[PDB]
């Protein structure tokens, strides 16, 4: 409703770096808000793509940002009559970034890894990896829970069980308020998908450089399965957290699995031991239900509600024809111990191939009426196909079914304006929460400041 679309702020990265592929707000120890931006095709030392991270201080004028520096050198360790290798070429550092406390977590889902033992090998595969930084102190750490030193032949002899070689850890990421990092790994267990969790504090305290294979004893991984419903389901394509079991001492995980059960799609809610509390099934095959999940109480009852994006949902139209436009599903959490039911609201795109629902950002209470609000991206939407971000306001019965405000992309065609979103943080300290929108195809980020209601 009251985002300012006239005076925007633009930050920009190098050409071709995909600056803006991911982003988040970041508060330093003093509460000063900055913006962390991931740029997953930034050039490394060897003039080869590795990805990179930028930490943009807040300025109404925007501009360029300093690097948040990470080690971009391939590593090798000869230990235990084996040879451990990391490969950072085309790893996509910055394909996800998330901030918690005064720490930044930036991940390289396609960092590759191999282990050599005489003539055998584990196989060079994308286990992914996450890099952790405390900018003010300079402290650094890594977390790569899917690395292993098992040789190829063993996986074959055991029929590929507990195969974490293609995890792509960091594909998605989130941190609990208590500071537990949770990583989506859509390729885990031969492309079923897994989740890896561990306290940030324990990640830092157990990390040392050059080890490459080390234990984080407080970590917790989800489980392989024999159920074909999960095969190639990419469990962990997206992740979030929230309170869904009525016990405030537990944190619940939300996991998107957009190809679950032969591309039907699904979203599951779990406890922190990965036991399944609910499952939301997709409505239409290949719609990629679960591509994005968002958690926020929109109807002001203090109970978190769940939003799910299916950006490829095909809407039914005249003469038995279908139109890919994307769809968003609202699930309101019922009072006390009860299942999430049918959706309370369906939001459906209008522009062909717009991918409405590709990203869903909680905004907090944008217009300050007592109900939290959301922003939905259609990165190829709008009458020109350049991208659109649509704002829907919360209300006692859930969400308004029509947008209160629409943001047309200020960038050229192909920018993917809205592919990444983040709201609910007041960057300029004016008492209203603001919205940052990434347009990685244009290598830029746009900041929309919220203003008093007209």
């Amino acid at each position, epitope marked *: 409703l009251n985002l300012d679309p006239v005076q925007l702020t633009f930050y920009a990265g190098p050409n071709g770096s995909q600056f803006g592929f991911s982003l988040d707000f970041h508060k330093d120890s003093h509460g000063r808000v900055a913006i962390v931006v991931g740029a997953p095709r930034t050039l490394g030392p060897s003039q080869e793509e590795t990805g990179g991270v930028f930490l943009c201080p807040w300025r109404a004028e925007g501009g360029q940002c300093p690097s948040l520096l990470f080690d971009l050198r391939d590593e090798t*360790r*000869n*230990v*235990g*009559s084996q040879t451990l290798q990391t490969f950072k070429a085309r790893q996509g550092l910055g394909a996800s970034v998330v901030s918690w406390s005064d720490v930044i977590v930036a991940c390289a889902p396609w960092q590759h890894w191999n282990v050599l033992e005489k003539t055998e090998e584990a196989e060079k595969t994308p286990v992914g990896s996450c890099f952790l930084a405390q900018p003010e102190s300079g402290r650094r750490a890594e977390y790569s829970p899917c690395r292993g*030193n098992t040789l190829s032949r*063993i996986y074959v002899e*055991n029929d590929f069980s507990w195969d974490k070689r293609y995890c792509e850890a960091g594909f998605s990421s989130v941190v609990t308020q208590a500071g537990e990092l949770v990583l989506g790994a859509p390729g885990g267990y031969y492309f079923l998908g897994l989740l890896a969790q561990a306290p940030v504090a324990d990640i830092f305290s*157990s990390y*040392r450089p*050059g*080890i490459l*294979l*080390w*234990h*984080v*004893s407080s970590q917790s991984l989800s489980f392989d399965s024999s159920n074909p419903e999960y095969f190639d389901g990419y469990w962990g394509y997206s992740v979030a957290v929230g309170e869904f079991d009525g016990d405030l001492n537990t944190t619940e995980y939300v996991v998107g699995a957009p190809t679950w059960s032969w591309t039907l799609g699904a979203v599951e809610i779990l406890d922190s031991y990965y036991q399944r509390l609910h499952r939301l099934r997709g409505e239409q095959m290949a719609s990629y239900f679960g591509h994005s999940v968002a958690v926020t109480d929109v109807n002001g009852d203090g109970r978190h509600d769940l939003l799910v994006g299916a950006p490829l949902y095909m809407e039914s139209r005249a003469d038995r024809k279908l139109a890919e436009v994307g769809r968003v599903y609202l699930f309101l959490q019922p009072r006390g111990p009860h299942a999430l039911g049918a959706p309370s609201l369906l939001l459906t795109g209008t522009q062909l191939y717009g991918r409405f629902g590709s990203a869903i950002a909680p905004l907090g209470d944008l217009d300050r009426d007592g109900y939290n609000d959301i922003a939905v991206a259609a990165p190829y939407g709008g009458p020109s196909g350049r991208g659109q971000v649509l704002v829907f306001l919360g209300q006692s019965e859930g969400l308004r079914s029509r947008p209160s405000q629409v943001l047309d992309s200020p960038f050229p065609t192909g920018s993917a304006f809205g592919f990444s979103l983040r709201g609910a943080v007041d960057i300029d300290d004016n008492g209203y929460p603001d919205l940052i929108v990434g347009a990685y195809g244009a290598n830029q980020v746009a900041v929309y400041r919220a203003q008093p209601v007209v």
Partner: antibody, heavy 119, light 108 residues
Framework: EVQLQQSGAELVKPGASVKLSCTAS????????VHWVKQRPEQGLEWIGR????????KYDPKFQGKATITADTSSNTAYLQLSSLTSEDTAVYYC????????????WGQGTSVTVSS | DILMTQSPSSMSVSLGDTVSITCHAS??????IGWLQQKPGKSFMGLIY???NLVDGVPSRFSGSGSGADYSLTISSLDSEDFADYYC?????????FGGGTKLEIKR
């Protein structure tokens, strides 16, 4: 807290066999490698082998191939060292070991089990 | 197998001294070395891993250094508890192998 609690001293005859135990206290035996090390005053310390209790795969120093057999039961969170066709030279102290952080290190040690082979 | 030649076999020193044990390997081990303490008539406590990294709970008067095939354990300002046995161990290759040991004894 990580603790490795080993079985009590054994007192056996030559040619017989014995099976020592290493029970994980405060953690899951499945988390890391578990090693066995033999100690004697003259000969000092000698590495026997390791097991990955998650899958049962083992390694041994060729010196102990035949006598040493390492196993693990994740159910009882315990790792075992079986010694066969015992001999005076098998008279030694035996420790189980696991790393702290480094997959390949040797940081936590049990209290050790005394073995004495005699007729 | 890799041979770990640890020196000196023993040393007589006094509280407050700064002393240094060394360990030489038969080939490069690229810091894949650990250091161990065994107090009289007791089991083992880890001190160092990967050449320089303190095991959790170990005082900082202990330090590890070295590279290639030559490494050192150092104890600044000896404490009464520090008079014990010390062993290096390499895990660059299987089978893991140990040093002969070093005993810190009281000088008088």
């Amino acid at each position: 807290e990580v603790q490795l609690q080993q079985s009590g001293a054994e007192l056996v005859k030559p040619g017989a066999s014995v099976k020592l135990s290493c029970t994980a206290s405060g953690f899951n035996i499945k988390d890391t490698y578990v090693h066995w090390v033999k100690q004697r005053p003259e000969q000092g310390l000698e590495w026997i082998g390791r097991i990955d209790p998650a899958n049962g795969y083992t390694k041994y120093d060729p010196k102990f191939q035949g006598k040493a057999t390492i196993t693990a039961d994740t159910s009882s969170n315990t790792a075992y060292l079986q010694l066969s066709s015992l001999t005076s030279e098998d008279t030694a102290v035996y420790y189980c070991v696991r790393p702290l952080y480094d997959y390949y290190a040797m940081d936590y040690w049990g209290q050790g089990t005394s073995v004495t082979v005699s007729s | 197998d890799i041979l770990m030649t640890q020196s000196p076999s023993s040393m007589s020193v006094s509280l407050g001294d700064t002393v240094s044990i060394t360990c030489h390997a038969s080939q490069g081990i690229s810091s894949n070395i650990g250091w161990l303490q065994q107090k009289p008539g007791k089991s083992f406590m880890g001190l160092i891993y990967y050449g320089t990294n303190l095991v959790d709970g170990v005082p900082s008067r202990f330090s590890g250094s070295g590279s290639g095939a030559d490494y050192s354990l150092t104890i600044s300002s000896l404490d009464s508890e520090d008079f014990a046995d010390y062993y290096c161990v390499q895990y660059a290759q299987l089978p893991y192998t140990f040093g002969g040991g070093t005993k810190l004894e009281i000088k008088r």
